[PDB]
Amino acid sequence: ALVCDNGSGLVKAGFAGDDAPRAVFPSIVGRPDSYVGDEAQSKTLKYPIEHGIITNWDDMEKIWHHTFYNELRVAPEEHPTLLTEAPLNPKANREKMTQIMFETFNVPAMYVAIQAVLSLYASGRTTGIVLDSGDGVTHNVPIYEGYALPHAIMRLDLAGRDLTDYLMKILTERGYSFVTTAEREIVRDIKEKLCYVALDFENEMATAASSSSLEKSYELPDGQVITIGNERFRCPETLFQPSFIGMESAGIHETTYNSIMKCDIDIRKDLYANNVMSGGTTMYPGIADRMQKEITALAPSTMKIKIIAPPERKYSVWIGGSILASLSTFQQMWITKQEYDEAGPSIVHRKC
Ligand SMILES: CC1=C(O)[C@@](O)([C@@H]2C[C@H]3OC(=O)[C@H](C)[C@@H]4CCC[C@@]5(CC[C@H](O5)[C@H](O)[C@@]5(C)CC(=O)[C@H](O5)[C@H]5C[C@]6(C)CC[C@](O5)(O6)[C@H]5CC[C@](C)(C[C@H](C)/C=C(C)/C=C/[C@H]3O2)O5)O4)OCC1
Numbered sequence: 001a002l003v004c005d006n007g008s009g010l011v012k013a014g015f016a017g018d019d020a021p022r023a024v025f026p027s028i029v030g031r032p033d034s035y036v037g038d039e040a041q042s043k044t045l046k047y048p049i050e051h052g053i054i055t056n057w058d059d060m061e062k063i064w065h066h067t068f069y070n071e072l073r074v075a076p077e078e079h080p081t082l083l084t085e086a087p088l089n090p091k092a093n094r095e096k097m098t099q100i101m102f103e104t105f106n107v108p109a110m111y112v113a114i115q116a117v118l119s120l121y122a123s124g125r126t127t128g129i130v131l132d133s134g135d136g137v138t139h140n141v142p143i144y145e146g147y148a149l150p151h152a153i154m155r156l157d158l159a160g161r162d163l164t165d166y167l168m169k170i171l172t173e174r175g176y177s178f179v180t181t182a183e184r185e186i187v188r189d190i191k192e193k194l195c196y197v198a199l200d201f202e203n204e205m206a207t208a209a210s211s212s213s214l215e216k217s218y219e220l221p222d223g224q225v226i227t228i229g230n231e232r233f234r235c236p237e238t239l240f241q242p243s244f245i246g247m248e249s250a251g252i253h254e255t256t257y258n259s260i261m262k263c264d265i266d267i268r269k270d271l272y273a274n275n276v277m278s279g280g281t282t283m284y285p286g287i288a289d290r291m292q293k294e295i296t297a298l299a300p301s302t303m304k305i306k307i308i309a310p311p312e313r314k315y316s317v318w319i320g321g322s323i324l325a326s327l328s329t330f331q332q333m334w335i336t337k338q339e340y341d342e343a344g345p346s347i348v349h350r351k352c
C-alpha cells in the first residue's frame with residue numbers, strides 16, 4: 001500500500017510498512033508547461049493546499065501524479081492508497097479526493113485518515129490529545145481509542161508560514177530588510193535554525209534588553225551577517241499569544257485546554273497525561289516545557305500532565321499512516337473500487 005500525507009507546505013510519500021517516507025517535497029506547482037514539487041523548486045509558484053484544505057484540484061492532481069510516477073515509481077492502479085486530511089475538512093473535499101483517486105488514478109482501494117490521529121498512532125497510543133502544527137494550519141485533536149472526537153477539535157489559522165512572515169516583519173523592524181519571496185525562504189531557514197520557545201517571555205525579553213547573551217549570528221546568502229536576539233523567541237511566542245500578529249485566537253495552550261474541557265470527564269485525565277506534539281511547527285526547542293508550564297496553570301492542581309514530543313514529529317503523520325495501512329486488521333477498512341462504483345464519492349462518509 002502507498003501512504004501519501006499532503007500538507008500545505010510539504011508532501012510526505014512512501015510505502016506502508018516503511019519507517020520513514022521515501023520522498024518529502026514542496027507542495028507547489030510552478031508555471032513559466034507546468035512543473036511540480038521538487039522539479040518546480042529547481043526552477044510562478046502556487047500552493048494547491050491552503051491551511052490544510054485542498055483548494056486547487058487540477059494542481060492537486062499534478063501533485064498526486066508526480067508522487068506516484070516520479071517520487072514512488074508506481075502505477076496507482078496497482079496499489080491501495082492511504083491519504084491524509086485535516087481534522088476538519090469540508091464534505092465536498094472528501095468526496096472530490098475520493099472521486100479523483102478512483103476515477104482519475106484508478107486506485108483499487110483507498111482510505112483517508114485524519115492527520116493528527118495518525119500522529120497519535122506513531123507515538124504508540126490510541127488515546128491522547130494531539131497538537132498538530134504545520135506550515136499552514138494548527139489543530140488540537142482529542143482522540144479516544146483510535147478515533148478523533150469531532151465535537152472537541154480546535155483549529156487555529158496560525159502556523160509555520162505565518163511565523164516566518166512575522167520573523168521577517170520583526171527583523172525588518174530591527175533594521176534589516178526581509179520582504180521578498182526569496183527572502184521568505186531565507187527567513188524560514190533562520191527560523192528553523194535559531195528560534196526557540198522561551199520558558200518565560202518577559203524574563204527573556206529582559207535578558208535580551210540588557211545583554212547579548214541570547215544573540216546568534218547568521219550569514220545571509222548575500223554576504224551580510226545579521227544578528228538575531230529576542231527575535232529568536234518572539235517569533236514562536238506567537239503560538240502562545242496570537243495577538244502578536246493581530247489574531248484573536250486563544251494560544252495553543254488555551255486551545256489544548258479548551259479541547260480537553262469539551263470531552264467527557266472520564267477521559268480528560270487520559271488526555272492531560274498524553275499530549276502529543278506533531279508537525280514541523282512543534283520543533284522549536286523549549287516548546288514541551290512551555291506547554292507543560294502553561295497547561296499546568298490552567299488545569300486542576302491535582303491533574304497529572306505530560307507533553308510528549310517525539311523526535312520524529314516532522315514525519316509522525318506519515319509514520320502513523322505507514323503503521324495503520326500495514327495492520328492486518330485494517331484490510332477490511334479500505335474503500336474498494338466496487339464500493340465506489342456502487343455508492344460514488346459519498347462512500348467516503350460511511351467508511352472513513
Ligand atoms: C469524519 C470527517 C469529518 O468530521 C469532517 O469532514 C468535518 C465535519 C464537518 O464539520 C463541520 O461542519 C463543523 C466545522 C464542525 C462539526 C462538529 C463540531 C465543530 C468542530 C469544531 C467546532 O464545532 C467549532 O468549529 C470550533 C469550536 C473549533 C474552533 O477552533 C472554532 O470553532 C473555530 C475557530 C476558527 C479559527 C474559525 C472557524 C474554525 O473553528 O476556525 C473552523 C471550523 C470550520 C472551519 C471554517 C474550517 C474548514 C475549512 C472546515 C470545515 C467547514 C469542515 C467541515 C466538516 O469537517 O474553521 O465543527 O472533517 C474530517 C473528517
Ligand SMILES: Nc1ncnc2c1ncn2[C@@H]1O[C@H](COP(=O)(O)OP(=O)(O)OP(=O)(O)O)[C@@H](O)[C@H]1O
Nearest residue numbers: 007008009010134135136137160192279280281283
Ligand atoms: N526546526 C524547526 N523549527 C521551527 N519550525 C520548523 C522546523 N522545521 C520545520 N519547521 C516548519 O514546519 C513547517 C512544515 O511542517 P509540516 O510538514 O508539519 O507542515 P505541512 O504538513 O506542510 O503543513 P500543514 O500541516 O499546516 O498543512 C514549515 O513552516 C517549517 O518552516
Ligand SMILES: C/C1=C/C(=O)O[C@@H]2C[C@@H](CC[C@H](C)/C=C\CC1)O[C@@](O)([C@@H]1CSC(=O)N1)C2
Nearest residue numbers: 009010026027028041135160161164184185188
Ligand atoms: C526546504 C523546504 C522547506 C519547507 O518547509 O517548504 C515549504 C514549501 C515551500 C514552497 C516554496 C519553496 C521556494 C520550495 C522549497 C523549500 C522547501 O514554502 C514554504 O517554505 C513556505 C514559504 S516560507 C515558510 O515558512 N513556508 C514551506
Ligand SMILES: [Ca+2]
Nearest residue numbers: 007008115134
Ligand atoms: Ca501536516
Ligand SMILES: [Ca+2]
Nearest residue numbers: 241242243248
Ligand atoms: Ca490574545
